[PDB]
Every structure is written in C-alpha cells, then in structure tokens.
Design a protein around this nucleic acid. Structure first.
Ligand code: MG
Ligand code: MG
Lengths: 109, 51, 56, 199, 236
RNA sequence: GGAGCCUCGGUUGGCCUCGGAUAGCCGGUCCCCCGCGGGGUCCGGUGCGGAGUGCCCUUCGUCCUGGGAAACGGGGCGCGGC
RNA sequence: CCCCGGAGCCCCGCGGACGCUACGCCGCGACGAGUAGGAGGGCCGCUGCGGUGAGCCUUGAAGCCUAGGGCGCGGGCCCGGG
RNA sequence: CCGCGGCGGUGCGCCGCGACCGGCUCCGGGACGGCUGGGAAGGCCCGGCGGGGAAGGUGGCUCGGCCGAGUGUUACAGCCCCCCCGGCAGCAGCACUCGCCGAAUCCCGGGGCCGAGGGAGCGAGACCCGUCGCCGCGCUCUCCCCCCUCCCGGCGCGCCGG
C-alpha cells in the first residue's frame, strides 16, 4: 500500500566529454553518494516510467496510458555513488533529469 | 575451433594439462587445515594461561 | 628502453602467463595450448612433452 | 520537493555551482536573500570586476548587448547561467527551475530554508581574508532597491521573532507536559530509548 | 552398493589419493582372473489361412519430409531443471519473516515455512492476519527480515508440495471459433482441501506469533518505503 | 453530479528566529529597567550540537465482538461570527 | 578361433554424404587507414546481335507515381497498390 | 479421438526463472615464506652503571582557597626519559591494522555485469546414440563391522529388522 522503489534520477548517458554513448545510463540514486553505499543497487531492476496518448496493455490489468522501459543497474559509476544502468531499449533523452524507479526486487538480501 | 578454458580457474583443465596439480592442491588444503587447527589450540592455550 | 618495460619474473608470473595466455606457434598458426599433445608434437624432440615442461 | 537555500553567507560562485547541478537533475531550487551572498576577495577588487563587465557592450548597438543586471538576485542567476548549457533546451529547462529573490518574499519567508555549507564563507574562506557583500556591490553598481529590501526585511524579522517566541513557548509546554505525564508514558518512552532516541 | 569411500575435500578434489584409495577399496585381493539371415530378430504374430504371419514391431516411416535438421553435439553439462542443485540465501531460515515484494501480496509481510523441491519458498502470512494464504514465492523477490518465530516443530503436511501449488486449467479443441470457449470458465475456486491445509498450518503457527509481542500487528502491516529512508542504509 | 478527447510531471509532509564562528543554545529569575511580552545582570543547564535536518511530524491493509490502558476527541468538502 | 546382404556400429580397408554447381563444399590461423596510382570480383547497371527460357504480355507490356512489404555492405533488385 | 508416450524441429505477443560454461569486475575468508633468520612494542621483573629534561622537592614572585594553580633557579630520583652491562615463555610483518616484499613458500567460498553461436546419424528383419581426452571417484563383481535412521515389515513416541 506504499512505495516499493528507491527513487533515482537519470542523469544522462555514459559518455566521454565529446562522445556520447547512449546505451548505458547514469542514474543518480536518491540518498546514496559513495562508491561504497552502492553495492546494494548493483543487480537491481529499474524502470523509466512514463505515459503516452495511445493506450497499451498492462500485465495484471486493463489497458492503460502508461509504459516503461525496463532496465538493470549494472555497475557502480565514479566515486560519488552514481551508478550505471543498461536498459532494454536505450532511454529517450526526454527522460534526462526525470525519475526512474529502481526496484528492490532482484534481491541478494 | 577449441575453446580455451582457463586452467587456473578450471580445475579439470589444469589436470588434463598438468595432472600433478591435483596432489599439490590436495595439500595446501590439508596443509592449511592442519595449520588452522594448530592456531586454535594455541589460542586455547593462551586463553587458558590467561585464566 | 623507452618502448619496453621489462624485468625478472617470478615463477608464478611464468605460470600465469603460460597457462592463461600461452599459445603455441604450430605450422605458423597461433594455437591455444589446450592440451599437452600440442606442446609435445612440436617440442618432443627436445624432451618437452607437456605444459609443465615448457614452463620449466 | 523544493530546495530553499538562504543565499546569505555563501560564496557567489560556490553556491551557484551546487545550484546549477541540482537544477539540471530536476530539483526545483529557490535561492533567497541573495543580497546576503558574499563574494570572496575584497570589495574594491570586485566592484572593479563588475565595472569591467559594465564596460563590455556591443559598440554599434549597445541595446543588443551583454545585459548587465544590477540586482543581486539577477547577478546570482547570471552566474548560475554561466554554469549551465543555456543555449540548449535542457539548459533553459533547467534555468526555469531556479527561482531567485532580492531579499526573501512571502512564499519562502515562512519556510525552513536550508544552507549549503560547501558554499559557506565561514567554511571556505580563511578568516583573515576580505570579501564583498553582494548587496553593497550591487548597490554601488546601480541597484536601486537596497533600502526597500532592507526595510521590508526588518519588518520580516520582527514578524519572525514573534513566531519564534511562540514556538519557544510550545516547546516549553511540551517539556512540561512530558514531566507532568511521564509515569503514564513510561512504557513507551522507554522503548524509544532502547531503540536509540531520547538520549 | 557401498557409499563413497573417500569424502570430499573440495568439489572434485578427493581428500585421499589414488594409492591411499587403493588400500581402502582394496585393489589388492580384489583381483578378477577372467580370461539375422534366417533367424529373425524382432517381429512375430499369429493368424488364420496361409499360416502364421511375421509382423514387424516399429515399421518404417510412411513419409519423409524434403529436408531436415541434422543432430547436435552432446554439450556435457547442462542439466534439466529438475536435476539442478537448489540454493537458499542463508538469511532465509525456516520460520523467518519476509517481505514479499512483487505479486498482489505486494509489500505484505509474511512467514517463511520451507523450501520446496522447485527452489521456491513455501510461505504463509497466516491468512488470518495478513490475508496471505499458503503460497509459493521465489527467493529473489523477497527481502528476508531478521525476525524469526521458532517454527521449529510444526508438521507442515508432507502432501503439500510443489506439485499441488501449481496452476491448472485449459485443454485444446472444443467449439473454439465464435465468442465462447474458456474466456468464460472464469474463476479460480479455492477447494476444501486447500482450506483444510491452511487451517492445519495456521493453527500451528498462529500461536507462536501470538507468543511474540506485537508481531501479529507487524505481520498485518505492509512494508513500504517513505521519505527520508533508504534500502541501502537501513536493515531488515 | 454523468460521460469524454488531450497534456503530462509526480508516487507522505515539515507552518519561518536572528545570527555567531578566537563562539554559541536554553532555562529561570531571587533582583533591576522598559512596552502578557522586550532589555539587563546573576545563577543553573547543555555545547563534536538529542530543545540534534545524523532531525521532527505523519502511518501503510478492511471489518466483526468484548476486555484492558488511553478518553471527549473526531467528523458531516457540517454550518454562522470575530 | 566360422560369413558384415548382417560386426551392429566411435570405425569399418565389402559400398558409400543430408555434403560433392570440385569455378563446389569444409576446417584452422592471422590480419582490415588511404589521395595520386594500379589490380581483382560484381546473380551492379544501360542499348543492340547469336543462342536459349514449349519465358512473360489486352484476364494489361513499356514507362510513370507511391507515409505499402522486403532483399542486398553496396552498385542495385524483388514484390503490393495506382 | 485420447495419450502433451518417444524424437525432431517451434514458441502469436510480453515476461520471469533456473543450473552449466567463456570472459571480466569486485567482496569475504583463512594458511605460508623471507628480512637486521625482520625493526619497534607489549608483559614479568631483578641486579647493577652512568648521563639529561626537568620533580612528590626547594626557592623569588604572582594568582586563588597549610592546600591548589602559574612563572624562575641548582639539580639527586621518591614524574619520567636516555645509554651501559645479563635474561625470561607471547610471539606472529600482530584485529591493539605502528612501518615490507612476496606465493609451486596458496587455497577456500560469495556476489555484479556481458556473452552462449558451434552442430563427427538421410541403412534395407537388429539404437534415431551415444560420446573423445581428463578427473577421480563412486560403485560393483572381496568379505567384515559400526552408526544413523527415509520407505516398508515387526515389536514395545521408543526399540528391532532400504
Ligand atoms: Mg500511475
Ligand atoms: Mg584498405
């Protein structure tokens, strides 16, 4: 009856300064700020979630405007608890600086 | 084409190349078991001497 | 000097190179030393017949 | 969901940095009482440095030119915008989240307003160094509404005193009420101090 | 048929040896001095006039197709699910408490009972308190809390097992085409057997939780994150 | 109150002293001055800050009956005045 | 101490691909910047002649158009509708 | 037609799992070698032998209530420090993490990610199939015994006989 996903931003794609690489996001996870406090999240399932004009289906439900691109937090990005994910399609850049729900549910706990 | 599986990791591959590794690595488990025990009995004898 | 780094290896270094990255040069084709019968075939004339002998 | 930082006692470009990066991650940020913000290095120094910036202008048609805002709010907002990608859409989208103020007006006068210590003068300057107050610097460079901002803010602080006083009174009541009550709350309060509060 | 005469030191490496084994098994003393045309192979039948016929068990194919795939290559390892070894996070002991994350018992707290054959967890949030019946869950979608009831001694029925926790309906043909056929049927009904089994388990567990103070309430409550709180930081 | 295109973000709140930094915070004044408060001194407390944003508040299944602790609190987008 | 028109087969010398357009098919390795310039292969393409498809075509050729469907690294090509 | 028996290839669309192998990337454990056969340290103390900062001391002055605090001087040991002779088991590159270098003197277990890329059966009365190399083992065709006890059988949850 409440939230079951730790919040995270999608900060952008993996990149060198002058060369972007779209297939590999950088998620800033809320409240985690050290390549130390980011083991937990490795292996986890994450979802850019959003909605659109035409309906879609929905697992365990009637048709609905919301869609997601699933992903997976793959590994731990540079020092300040930033992380890397890898989604099943690449994220759309409209997303840059929005929410992507990171789940708990591939747990090693 | 033959897949090179790494012997260092893959126990059996190691053996197929160098069969003696089985014995070496039988020891240095047992050798270490021996030595782990001995350290427990030392630690017991230090706790007993402290008591 | 400026192009290479070099030095005197360990034993371990030899093994870790030869098992993990050791490939024969057999009929000029690079070939992974998967089995001893590749080393022997080409160095048997020298009493070198298995991975272990090569390291030695 | 909103960051309200009291601009006071920060270092101009130090706080800007943090704000920029926040604003680009999609945090709606409000800075406030910018005229409190203080820039490292001595005053005369910085006035001169603003006066360079006023010297800059397109010869042929000044009207097109670098738009030297005089208001210390704007001045901060200009220096965030220098730490953003503001030609793009995403940089302009970010900049529309930053909200800045000359003093501190009604929506955020009654808000717990944060501080960034990494931008804080008392942390980042050595205490034997000089620093401008932006308020002064704006003032001498052409900002009008210093006195008006000040004299509204006296009226803000007086009103706040009252709020605080009344808070203090409720806190004193609570303390007294716990002392009145303690015996009938003992086997709660105990558990909150076995699991690490109250102590 | 004796068991293994050496133990395991580590996967694949025997504790003993060859020659230390030679002694144990005793390869000394256990030495074994040991120095169609007309006749049809596999058909045969009876029958009346002309005599008895010879059939042929397994008669060759009435048709071949024009092209076909050609074998594979043996592959060595790779072992059908049934035979796989199973696992379990050490944090999950019998009669631990879980947070079942993912299904319609989403965030519901619950009591773990046993590992099934499958690999899944048998679980129950004694349907009474929580509204979570005798159900399976997958290790993976399940936070293990550090709260444990001493479930130790409860005869969780033998007959309840991976097979009986398994979905059921639907066969092939019927009327099919139109606006009918198994779009109806409609409901999963619960079955008396299942209601008995739940009863039998609940009665046994339920006291144990009521012996712990608060725990029944804890269990009723749903897990859920909120503001100012982080999975990585907190603990279960 | 009923349907019905479209646009999307979100997925507990925090309702506030001023400020100081080679210092602060809170009490209570027995006592004194000013307009229940403000200022003062004095004393008593805290001060790696628990009268702590390392915080605080808020709870997250629904109902039944039939005991205790707690108990006059909550509501009717309850209604009129200051 | 015997014969494969039957040892039953991990090797079979009695006969041999699902495979074998031998300008075919298969397996190992290593390698792959390129103007000027050279060479190779194009089941890339245009027009015409000898052959050849018991080719296609008024039950619709050529050409033209195409938010239709495909192939090809590509040159280009095949389809659907008009 | 029911068998979803055996084999072969498949999934309409979206998904999830599992175990195996390849590769990485980390984590947690332990066992060892060497050295100035490590340096320091710790712990028990005893006997001596000196030297110095500076002391339960004394002294001039100051500041507080003979006592406490702050400066100052000569300086023994009744605060320590230092060297010199002689001797104990507690060490151990030490979870009292003070300072290395290492592993045939070295092994165990766990997690994250990416990947699967190949296909030694096209016989007419007898397999639609295994398997090569390596590990061992494991078992058996050799006998004994002991334990625990799952199925089943027997006797009183306990005991006895796969
Ligand atoms: Mg929604
Ligand atoms: Mg080239």
């Amino acid at each position: 009856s409440g939230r079951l996903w730790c919040k995270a931003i999608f900060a952008g794609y993996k990149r060198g300064l002058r060369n972007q690489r779209e297939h590999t996001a950088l998620l800033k996870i809320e409240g985690v700020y050290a390549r130390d406090e980011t083991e937990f999240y490795l292996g986890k399932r994450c979802a850019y979630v959003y909605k659109a004009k035409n309906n879609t289906v929905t697992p365990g439900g009637k048709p609905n405007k919301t869609r997601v691109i699933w992903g997976k937090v793959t590994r731990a990005h540079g020092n300040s608890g930033m992380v890397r994910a890898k989604f099943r399609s690449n994220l759309p850049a409209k997303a840059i600086g929005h929410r992507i729900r990171v789940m708990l549910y591939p747990s090693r706990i | 084409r033959v897949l090179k599986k790494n012997p260092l990791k893959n126990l059996r591959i190691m053996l197929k190349l160098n069969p003696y590794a089985k014995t070496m690595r039988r020891n240095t488990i047992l050798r270490q078991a021996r030595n782990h025990k001995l350290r427990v009995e030392r630690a017991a004898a230090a706790l007993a001497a402290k008591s | 000097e400026p192009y290479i780094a070099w030095g005197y290896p360990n034993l371990k270094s030899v093994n870790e190179l030869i098992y993990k990255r050791g490939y024969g040069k057999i009929n000029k084709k690079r070939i992974a030393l998967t089995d001893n019968a590749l080393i022997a075939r080409s160095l048997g004339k020298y009493g070198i017949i298995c991975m272990e002998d090569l390291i030695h | 969901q909103v960051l309200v930082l009291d601009g006071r006692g920060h270092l101009l470009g130090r706080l800007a940095a943090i704000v920029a990066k926040q604003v680009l991650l999609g945090r709606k940020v409000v800075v406030v009482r910018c005229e409190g913000i203080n820039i490292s290095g001595n005053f005369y120094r910085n006035k001169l440095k603003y006066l360079a910036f006023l010297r800059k202008r397109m010869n042929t048609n000044p009207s097109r030119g670098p738009y030297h805002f005089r208001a210390p709010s704007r001045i901060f907002w200009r220096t965030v915008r220098g730490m953003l990608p503001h030609k793009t859409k995403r940089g302009q989208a970010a900049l529309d989240r930053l909200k800045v103020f000359d003093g501190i007006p009604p929506p955020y006068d009654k808000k717990k307003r944060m501080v960034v210590p990494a931008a804080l003068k008392v942390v980042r300057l050595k205490p034997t160094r000089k620093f401008a107050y932006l308020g002064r610097l704006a003032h001498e460079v052409g900002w009008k509404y210093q006195a008006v901002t000040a004299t509204l803010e006296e009226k803000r602080k007086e009103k706040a005193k009252i709020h605080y006083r009344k808070k203090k009174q409720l806190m004193r009541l609570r303390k007294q009420a716990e002392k009145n009550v303690e015996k009938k709350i003992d086997r709660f309060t105990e558990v909150l101090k076995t699991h690490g509060f109250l102590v | 048929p004796h068991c293994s005469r050496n133990p395991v030191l580590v996967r694949g490496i025997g504790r003993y040896s060859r020659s230390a084994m030679y002694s144990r098994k005793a390869l000394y003393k256990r030495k074994y001095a040991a120095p169609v045309l007309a006749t049809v192979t596999k058909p045969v039948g009876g029958d009346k006039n002309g005599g008895t016929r010879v059939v042929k068990l397994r008669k060759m194919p009435r048709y071949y197709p024009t092209e076909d795939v050609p074998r594979k290559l043996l592959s060595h390892g790779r072992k059908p699910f049934s035979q796989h070894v199973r696992k379990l996070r050490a944090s999950i002991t019998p009669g631990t408490i879980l947070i079942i994350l993912t299904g319609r018992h989403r965030g519901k707290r619950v009591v773990f009972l046993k590992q099934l054959s499958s690999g899944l967890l048998l679980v129950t949030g004694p349907l009474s308190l929580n509204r979570v019946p005798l159900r399976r869950t997958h290790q993976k979608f399940v936070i293990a809390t550090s709260t444990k009831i001493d479930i130790s001694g409860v005869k969780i029925p033998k007959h309840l097992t991976d097979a009986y926790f398994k979905k059921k309906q639907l066969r092939k043909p019927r009327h099919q085409e139109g606006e009918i056929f198994d779009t109806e049927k409609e409901k999963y009904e619960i079955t008396e057997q299942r209601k008995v089994d739940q009863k039998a388990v609940d009665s046994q567990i339920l006291p144990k939780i009521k012996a712990v103070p608060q725990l029944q309430g804890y269990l009723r409550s749903v897990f859920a994150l909120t503001n100012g709180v982080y999975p990585h930081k907190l603990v279960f």
